Coordinates of N, CA and C in Angstrom, one line a residue:
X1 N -23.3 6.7 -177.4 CA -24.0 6.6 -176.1 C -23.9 7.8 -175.2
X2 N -24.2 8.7 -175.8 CA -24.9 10.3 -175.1 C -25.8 10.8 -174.5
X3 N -26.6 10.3 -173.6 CA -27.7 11.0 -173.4 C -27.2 12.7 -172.8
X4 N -27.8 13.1 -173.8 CA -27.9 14.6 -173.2 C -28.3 15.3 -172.5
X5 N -29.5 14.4 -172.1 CA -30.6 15.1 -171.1 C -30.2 14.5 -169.8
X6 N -29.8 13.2 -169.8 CA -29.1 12.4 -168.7 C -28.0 13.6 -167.8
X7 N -27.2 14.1 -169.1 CA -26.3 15.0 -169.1 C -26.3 16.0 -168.6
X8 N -27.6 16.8 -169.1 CA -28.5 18.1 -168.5 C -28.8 18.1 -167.3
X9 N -28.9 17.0 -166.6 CA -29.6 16.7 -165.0 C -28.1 17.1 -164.1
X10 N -27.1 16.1 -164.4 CA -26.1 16.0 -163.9 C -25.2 17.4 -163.9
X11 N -25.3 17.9 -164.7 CA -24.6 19.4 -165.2 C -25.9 20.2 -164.0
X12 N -26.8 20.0 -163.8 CA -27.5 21.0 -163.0 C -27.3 20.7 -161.8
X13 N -27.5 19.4 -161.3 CA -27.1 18.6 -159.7 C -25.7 19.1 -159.6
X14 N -24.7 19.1 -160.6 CA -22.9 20.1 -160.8 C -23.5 21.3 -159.7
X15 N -24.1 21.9 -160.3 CA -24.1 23.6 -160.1 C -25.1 23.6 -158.9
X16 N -26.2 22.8 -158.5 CA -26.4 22.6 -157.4 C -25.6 22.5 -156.3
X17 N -24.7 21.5 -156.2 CA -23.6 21.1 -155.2 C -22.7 22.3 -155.1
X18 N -22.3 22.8 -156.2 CA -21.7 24.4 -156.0 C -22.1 24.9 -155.3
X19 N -23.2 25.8 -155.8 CA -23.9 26.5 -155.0 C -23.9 26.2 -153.4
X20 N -24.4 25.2 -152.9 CA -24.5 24.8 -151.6 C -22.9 25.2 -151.0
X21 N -21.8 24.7 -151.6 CA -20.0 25.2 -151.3 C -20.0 26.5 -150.9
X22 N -20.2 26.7 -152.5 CA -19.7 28.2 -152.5 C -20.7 29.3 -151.0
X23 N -22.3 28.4 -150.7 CA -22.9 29.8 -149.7 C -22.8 29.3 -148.5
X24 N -22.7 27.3 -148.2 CA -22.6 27.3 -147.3 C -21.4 26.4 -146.5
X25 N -20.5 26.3 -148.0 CA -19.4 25.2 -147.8 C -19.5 23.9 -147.2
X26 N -20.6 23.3 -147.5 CA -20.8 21.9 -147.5 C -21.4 21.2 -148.5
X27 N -22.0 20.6 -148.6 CA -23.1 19.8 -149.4 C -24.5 19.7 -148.7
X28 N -25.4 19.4 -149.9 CA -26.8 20.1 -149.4 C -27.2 19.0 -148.6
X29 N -28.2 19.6 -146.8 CA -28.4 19.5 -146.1 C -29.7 19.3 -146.2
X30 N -30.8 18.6 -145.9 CA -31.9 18.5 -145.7 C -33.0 17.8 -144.6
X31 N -33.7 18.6 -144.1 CA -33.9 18.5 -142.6 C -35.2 17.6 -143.2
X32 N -36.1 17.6 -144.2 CA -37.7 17.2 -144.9 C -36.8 15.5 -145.2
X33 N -35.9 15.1 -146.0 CA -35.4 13.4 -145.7 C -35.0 13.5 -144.5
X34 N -34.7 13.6 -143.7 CA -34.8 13.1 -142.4 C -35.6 11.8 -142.0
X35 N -34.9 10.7 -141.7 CA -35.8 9.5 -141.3 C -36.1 8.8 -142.4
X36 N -35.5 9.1 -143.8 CA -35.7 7.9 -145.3 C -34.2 7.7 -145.5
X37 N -34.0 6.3 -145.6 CA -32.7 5.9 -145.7 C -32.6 6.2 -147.7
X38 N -31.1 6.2 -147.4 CA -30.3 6.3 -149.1 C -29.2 6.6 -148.9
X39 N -28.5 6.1 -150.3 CA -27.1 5.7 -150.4 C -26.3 7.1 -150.5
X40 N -27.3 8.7 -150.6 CA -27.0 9.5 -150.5 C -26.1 10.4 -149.6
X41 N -27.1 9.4 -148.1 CA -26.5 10.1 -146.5 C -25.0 10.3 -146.8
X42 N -24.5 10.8 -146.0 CA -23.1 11.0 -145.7 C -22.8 11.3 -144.2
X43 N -23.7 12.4 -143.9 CA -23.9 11.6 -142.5 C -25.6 12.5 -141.5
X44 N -25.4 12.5 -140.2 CA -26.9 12.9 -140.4 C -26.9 14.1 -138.5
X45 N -27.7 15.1 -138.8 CA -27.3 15.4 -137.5 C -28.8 15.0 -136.6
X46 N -29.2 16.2 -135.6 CA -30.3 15.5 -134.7 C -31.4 15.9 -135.7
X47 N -31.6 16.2 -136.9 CA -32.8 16.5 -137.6 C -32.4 16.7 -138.8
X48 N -31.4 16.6 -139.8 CA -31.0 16.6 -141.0 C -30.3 15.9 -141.6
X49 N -30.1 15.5 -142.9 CA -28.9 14.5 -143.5 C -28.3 14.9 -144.7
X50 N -26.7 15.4 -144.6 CA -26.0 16.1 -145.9 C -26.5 14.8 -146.4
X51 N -26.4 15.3 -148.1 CA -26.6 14.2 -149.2 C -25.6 14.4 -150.2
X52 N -25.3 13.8 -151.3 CA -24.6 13.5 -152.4 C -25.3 13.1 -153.4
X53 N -25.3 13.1 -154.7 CA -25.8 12.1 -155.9 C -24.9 11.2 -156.1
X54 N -25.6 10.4 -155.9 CA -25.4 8.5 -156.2 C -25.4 7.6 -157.4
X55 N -25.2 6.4 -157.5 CA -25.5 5.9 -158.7 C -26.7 5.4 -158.7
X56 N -27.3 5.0 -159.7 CA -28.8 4.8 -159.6 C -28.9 3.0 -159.7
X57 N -29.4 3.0 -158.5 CA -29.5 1.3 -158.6 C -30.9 0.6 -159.2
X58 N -31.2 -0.4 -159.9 CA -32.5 -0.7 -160.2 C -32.6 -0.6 -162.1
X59 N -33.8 -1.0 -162.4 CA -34.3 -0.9 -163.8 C -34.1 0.7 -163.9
X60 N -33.5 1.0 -164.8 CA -33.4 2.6 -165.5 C -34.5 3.0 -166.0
X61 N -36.1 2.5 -166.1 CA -37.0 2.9 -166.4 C -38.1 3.1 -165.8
X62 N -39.3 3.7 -166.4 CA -40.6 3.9 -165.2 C -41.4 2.9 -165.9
X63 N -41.1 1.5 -167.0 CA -42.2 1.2 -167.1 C -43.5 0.2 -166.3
X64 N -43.1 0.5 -165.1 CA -44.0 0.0 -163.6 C -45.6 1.3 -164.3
X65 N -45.1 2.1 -164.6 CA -46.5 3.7 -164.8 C -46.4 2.7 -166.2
X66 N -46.1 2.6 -167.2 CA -46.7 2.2 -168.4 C -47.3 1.0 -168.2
X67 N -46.6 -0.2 -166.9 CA -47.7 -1.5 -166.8 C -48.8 -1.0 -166.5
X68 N -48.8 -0.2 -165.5 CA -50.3 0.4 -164.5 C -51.4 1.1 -165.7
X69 N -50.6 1.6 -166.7 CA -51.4 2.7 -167.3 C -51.3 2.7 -168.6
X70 N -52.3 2.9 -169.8 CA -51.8 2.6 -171.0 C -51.3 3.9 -171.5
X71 N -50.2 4.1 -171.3 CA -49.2 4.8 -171.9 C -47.9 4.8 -173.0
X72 N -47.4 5.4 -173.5 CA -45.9 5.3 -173.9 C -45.6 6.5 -173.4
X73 N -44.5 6.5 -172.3 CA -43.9 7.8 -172.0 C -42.6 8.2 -172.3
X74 N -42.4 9.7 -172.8 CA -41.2 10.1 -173.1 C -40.0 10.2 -172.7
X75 N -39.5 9.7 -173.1 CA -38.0 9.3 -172.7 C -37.0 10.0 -171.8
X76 N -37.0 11.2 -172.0 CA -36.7 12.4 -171.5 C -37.2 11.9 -169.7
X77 N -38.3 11.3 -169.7 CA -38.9 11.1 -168.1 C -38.3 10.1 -167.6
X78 N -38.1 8.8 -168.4 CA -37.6 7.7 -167.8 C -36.2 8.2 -167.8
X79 N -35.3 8.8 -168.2 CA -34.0 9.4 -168.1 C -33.8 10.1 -166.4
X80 N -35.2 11.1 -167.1 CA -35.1 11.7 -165.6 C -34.8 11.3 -164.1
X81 N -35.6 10.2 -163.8 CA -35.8 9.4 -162.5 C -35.3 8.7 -162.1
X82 N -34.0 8.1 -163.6 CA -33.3 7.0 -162.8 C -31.9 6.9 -163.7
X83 N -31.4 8.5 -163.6 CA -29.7 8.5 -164.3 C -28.9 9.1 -162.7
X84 N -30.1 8.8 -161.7 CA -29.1 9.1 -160.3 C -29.8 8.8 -159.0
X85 N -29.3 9.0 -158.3 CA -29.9 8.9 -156.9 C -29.7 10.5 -156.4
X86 N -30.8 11.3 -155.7 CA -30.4 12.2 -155.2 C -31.6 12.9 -154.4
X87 N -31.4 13.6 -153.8 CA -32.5 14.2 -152.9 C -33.0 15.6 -153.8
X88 N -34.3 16.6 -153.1 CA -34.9 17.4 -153.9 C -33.6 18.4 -153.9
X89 N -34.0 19.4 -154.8 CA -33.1 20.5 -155.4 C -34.1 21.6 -155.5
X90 N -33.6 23.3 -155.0 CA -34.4 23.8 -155.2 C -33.8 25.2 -156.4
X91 N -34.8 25.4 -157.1 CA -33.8 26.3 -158.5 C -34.6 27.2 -159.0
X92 N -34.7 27.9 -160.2 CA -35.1 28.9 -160.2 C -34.9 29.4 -162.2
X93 N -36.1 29.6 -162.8 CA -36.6 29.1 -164.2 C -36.9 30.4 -164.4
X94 N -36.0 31.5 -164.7 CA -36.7 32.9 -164.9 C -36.8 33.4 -163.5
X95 N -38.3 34.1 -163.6 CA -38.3 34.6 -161.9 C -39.7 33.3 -161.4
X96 N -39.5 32.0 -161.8 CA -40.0 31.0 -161.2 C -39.6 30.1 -160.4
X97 N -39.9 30.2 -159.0 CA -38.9 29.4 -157.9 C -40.0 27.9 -158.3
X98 N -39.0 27.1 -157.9 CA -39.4 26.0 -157.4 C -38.7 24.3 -157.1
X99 N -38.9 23.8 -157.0 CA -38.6 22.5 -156.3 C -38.6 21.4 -157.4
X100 N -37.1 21.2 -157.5 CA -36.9 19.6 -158.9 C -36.5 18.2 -158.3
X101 N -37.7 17.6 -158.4 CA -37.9 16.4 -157.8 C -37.1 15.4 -157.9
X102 N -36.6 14.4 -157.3 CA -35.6 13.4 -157.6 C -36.3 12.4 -157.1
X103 N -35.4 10.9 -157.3 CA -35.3 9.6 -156.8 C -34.5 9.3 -155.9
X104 N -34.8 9.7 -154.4 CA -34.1 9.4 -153.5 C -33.4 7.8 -153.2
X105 N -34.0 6.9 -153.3 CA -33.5 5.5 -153.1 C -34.2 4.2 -153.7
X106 N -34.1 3.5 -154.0 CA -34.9 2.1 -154.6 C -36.4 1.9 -154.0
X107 N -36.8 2.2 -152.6 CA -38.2 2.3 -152.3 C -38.7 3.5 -152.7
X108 N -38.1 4.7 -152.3 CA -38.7 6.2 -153.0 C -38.8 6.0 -154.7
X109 N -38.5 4.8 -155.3 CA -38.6 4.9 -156.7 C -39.6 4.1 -157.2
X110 N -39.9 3.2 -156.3 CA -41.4 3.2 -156.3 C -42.7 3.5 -156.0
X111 N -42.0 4.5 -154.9 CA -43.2 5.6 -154.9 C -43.4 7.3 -155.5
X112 N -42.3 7.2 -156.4 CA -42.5 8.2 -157.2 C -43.5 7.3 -158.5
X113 N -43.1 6.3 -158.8 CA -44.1 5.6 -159.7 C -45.6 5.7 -159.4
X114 N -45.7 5.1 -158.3 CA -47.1 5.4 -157.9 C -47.4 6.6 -157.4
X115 N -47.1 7.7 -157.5 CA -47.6 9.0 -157.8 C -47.7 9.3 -159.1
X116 N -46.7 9.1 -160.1 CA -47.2 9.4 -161.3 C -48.3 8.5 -161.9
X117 N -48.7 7.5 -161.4 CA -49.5 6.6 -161.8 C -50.9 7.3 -161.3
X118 N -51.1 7.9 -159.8 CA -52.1 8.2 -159.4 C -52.2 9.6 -160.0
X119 N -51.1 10.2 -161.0 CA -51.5 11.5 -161.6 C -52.1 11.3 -163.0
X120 N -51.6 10.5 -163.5 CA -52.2 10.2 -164.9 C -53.4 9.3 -164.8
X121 N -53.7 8.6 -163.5 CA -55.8 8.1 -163.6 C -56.4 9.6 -163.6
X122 N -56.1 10.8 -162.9 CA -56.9 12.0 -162.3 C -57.0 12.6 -163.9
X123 N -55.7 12.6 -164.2 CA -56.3 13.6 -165.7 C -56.6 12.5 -166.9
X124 N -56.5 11.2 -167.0 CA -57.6 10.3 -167.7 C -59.5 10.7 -167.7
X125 N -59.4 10.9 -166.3 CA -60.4 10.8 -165.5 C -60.8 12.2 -166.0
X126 N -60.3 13.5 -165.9 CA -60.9 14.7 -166.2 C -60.6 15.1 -168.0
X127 N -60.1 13.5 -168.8 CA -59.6 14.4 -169.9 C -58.8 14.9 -170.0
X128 N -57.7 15.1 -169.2 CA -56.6 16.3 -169.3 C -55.5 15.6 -170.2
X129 N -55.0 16.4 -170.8 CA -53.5 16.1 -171.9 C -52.7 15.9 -171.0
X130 N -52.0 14.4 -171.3 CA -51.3 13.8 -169.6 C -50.2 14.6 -169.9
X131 N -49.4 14.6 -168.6 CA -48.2 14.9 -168.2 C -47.6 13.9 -167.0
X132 N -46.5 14.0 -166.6 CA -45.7 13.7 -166.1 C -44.9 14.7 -165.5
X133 N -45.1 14.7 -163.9 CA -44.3 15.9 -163.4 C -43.0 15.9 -163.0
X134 N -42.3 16.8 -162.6 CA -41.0 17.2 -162.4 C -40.4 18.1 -161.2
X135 N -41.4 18.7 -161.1 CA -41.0 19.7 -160.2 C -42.3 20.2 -159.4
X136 N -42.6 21.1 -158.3 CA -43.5 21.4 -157.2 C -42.9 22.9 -157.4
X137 N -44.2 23.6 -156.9 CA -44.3 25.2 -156.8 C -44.6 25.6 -155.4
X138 N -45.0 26.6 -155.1 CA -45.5 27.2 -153.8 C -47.3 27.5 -154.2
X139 N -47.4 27.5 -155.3 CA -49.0 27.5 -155.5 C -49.4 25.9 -155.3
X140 N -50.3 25.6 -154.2 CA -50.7 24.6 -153.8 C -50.8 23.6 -154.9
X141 N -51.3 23.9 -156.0 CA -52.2 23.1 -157.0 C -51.3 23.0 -158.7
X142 N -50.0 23.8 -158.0 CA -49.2 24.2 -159.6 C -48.2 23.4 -159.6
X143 N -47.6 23.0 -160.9 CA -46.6 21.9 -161.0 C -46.1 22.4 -162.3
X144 N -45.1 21.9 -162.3 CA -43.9 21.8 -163.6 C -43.8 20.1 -163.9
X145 N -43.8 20.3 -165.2 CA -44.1 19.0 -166.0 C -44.0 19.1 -167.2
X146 N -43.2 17.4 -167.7 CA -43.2 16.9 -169.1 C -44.5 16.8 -169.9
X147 N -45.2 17.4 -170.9 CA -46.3 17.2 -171.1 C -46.1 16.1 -172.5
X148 N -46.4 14.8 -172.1 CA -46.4 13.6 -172.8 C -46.4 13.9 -174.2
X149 N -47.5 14.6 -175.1 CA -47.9 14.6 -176.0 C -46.6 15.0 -177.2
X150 N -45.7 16.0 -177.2 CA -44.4 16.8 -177.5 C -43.3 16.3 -177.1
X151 N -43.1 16.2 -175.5 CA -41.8 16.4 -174.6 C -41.9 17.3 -174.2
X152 N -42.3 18.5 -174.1 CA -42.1 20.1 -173.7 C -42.2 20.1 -172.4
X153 N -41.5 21.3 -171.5 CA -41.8 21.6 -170.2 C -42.5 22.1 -169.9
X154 N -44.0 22.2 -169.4 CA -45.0 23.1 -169.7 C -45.1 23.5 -167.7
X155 N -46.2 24.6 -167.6 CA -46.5 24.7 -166.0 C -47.9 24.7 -166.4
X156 N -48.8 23.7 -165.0 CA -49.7 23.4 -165.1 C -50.1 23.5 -163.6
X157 N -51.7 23.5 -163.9 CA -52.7 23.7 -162.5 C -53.4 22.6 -162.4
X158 N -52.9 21.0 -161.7 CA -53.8 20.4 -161.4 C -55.5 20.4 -161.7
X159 N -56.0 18.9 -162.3 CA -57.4 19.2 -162.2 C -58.1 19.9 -163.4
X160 N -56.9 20.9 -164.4 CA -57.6 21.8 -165.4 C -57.0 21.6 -166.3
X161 N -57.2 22.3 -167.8 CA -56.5 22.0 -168.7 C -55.6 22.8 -169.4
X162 N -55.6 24.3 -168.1 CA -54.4 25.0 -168.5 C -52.9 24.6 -168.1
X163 N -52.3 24.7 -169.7 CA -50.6 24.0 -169.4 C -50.0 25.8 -170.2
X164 N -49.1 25.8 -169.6 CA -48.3 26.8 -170.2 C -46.7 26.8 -170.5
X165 N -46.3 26.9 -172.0 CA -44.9 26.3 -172.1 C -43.7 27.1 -171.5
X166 N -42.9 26.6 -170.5 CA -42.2 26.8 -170.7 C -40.6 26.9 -171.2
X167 N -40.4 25.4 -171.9 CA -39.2 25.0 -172.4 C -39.7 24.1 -173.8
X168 N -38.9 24.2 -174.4 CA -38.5 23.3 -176.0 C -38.6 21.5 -175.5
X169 N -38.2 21.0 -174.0 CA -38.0 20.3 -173.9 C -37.1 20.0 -172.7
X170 N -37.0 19.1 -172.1 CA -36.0 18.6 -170.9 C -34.6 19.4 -170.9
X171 N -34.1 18.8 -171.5 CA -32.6 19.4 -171.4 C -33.0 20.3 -171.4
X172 N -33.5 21.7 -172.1 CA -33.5 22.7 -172.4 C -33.5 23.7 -171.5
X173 N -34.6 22.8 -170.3 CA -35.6 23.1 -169.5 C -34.2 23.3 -168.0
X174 N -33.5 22.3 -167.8 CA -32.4 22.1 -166.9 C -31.4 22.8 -167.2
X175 N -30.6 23.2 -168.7 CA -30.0 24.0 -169.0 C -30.0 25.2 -168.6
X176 N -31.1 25.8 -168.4 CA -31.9 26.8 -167.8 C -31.5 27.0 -166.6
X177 N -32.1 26.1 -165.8 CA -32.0 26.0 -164.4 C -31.5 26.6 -163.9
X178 N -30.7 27.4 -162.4 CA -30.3 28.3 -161.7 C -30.3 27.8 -160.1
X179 N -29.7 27.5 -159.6 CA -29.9 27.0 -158.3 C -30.1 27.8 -157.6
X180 N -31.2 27.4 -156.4 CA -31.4 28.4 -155.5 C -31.6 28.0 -153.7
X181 N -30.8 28.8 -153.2 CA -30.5 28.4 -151.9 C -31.6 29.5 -150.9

């Protein structure tokens, strides 16, 4: 009973919480949750709330997106979303910044469902090879994502059908990872 990729998240949220020590000797602070409750808080000032990773309360799965949608999704995603509780992370994939999305609390975990639900009608809708995202860019319209069809970590542009690989797969993909402050 190993999950590895479970394992790969937690070894990255590790070196996240370092990070935050070692540059700013606390635990990561976030001013954007501000005003969403979770078991993360620790405490909160006039506009921010240090956080922690938590245990993950609830079904360990996303199949709420496979009731809504006819899917089978890769495992690697349902691992993803619910082997913790924790707020966003921001890291760095080569010289690619960007933002690795989490499951902040039992209500934020069903509305990361219904986002991924409202992403996979859009590319049903245009045809697109589904995916399942993970992470947020600074290009408005660009995402990091599991692309359903493999497992692979691909980057993609909303809306089109360009995906470009970047990893073998999840773990792989976190292994990688680099935190960035």
């Amino acid at each position: 009973m190993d999950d590895l990729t479970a394992q790969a998240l937690k070894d990255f949220t590790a070196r996240y919480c370092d990070a935050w020590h070692e540059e700013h000797k606390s635990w990561p602070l976030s001013e954007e949750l501000y005003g969403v409750p979770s078991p993360c808080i620790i405490s909160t000032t006039e506009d921010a709330v240090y956080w922690q990773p938590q245990p993950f309360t609830g079904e360990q799965n996303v199949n709420a997106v496979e009731r809504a949608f006819d899917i089978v999704i890769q495992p690697t995603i349902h691992t993803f979303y619910t082997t913790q509780f924790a707020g966003d992370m921001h890291a760095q994939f080569g010289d690619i910044k960007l933002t690795l999305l989490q499951t902040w609390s039992e209500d934020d975990f069903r509305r990361v469902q219904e986002n991924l639900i409202g992403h996979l009608v859009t590319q049903k809708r245009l045809k697109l090879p589904p995916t399942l995202f993970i992470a947020t860019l600074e290009e408005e319209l660009e995402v990091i994502s599991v692309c359903n069809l493999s497992g692979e970590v691909c980057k993609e542009t909303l809306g089109t059908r360009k995906r470009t690989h970047l990893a073998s797969n999840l773990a792989e993909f976190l292994n990688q990872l680099k935190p960035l402050l």
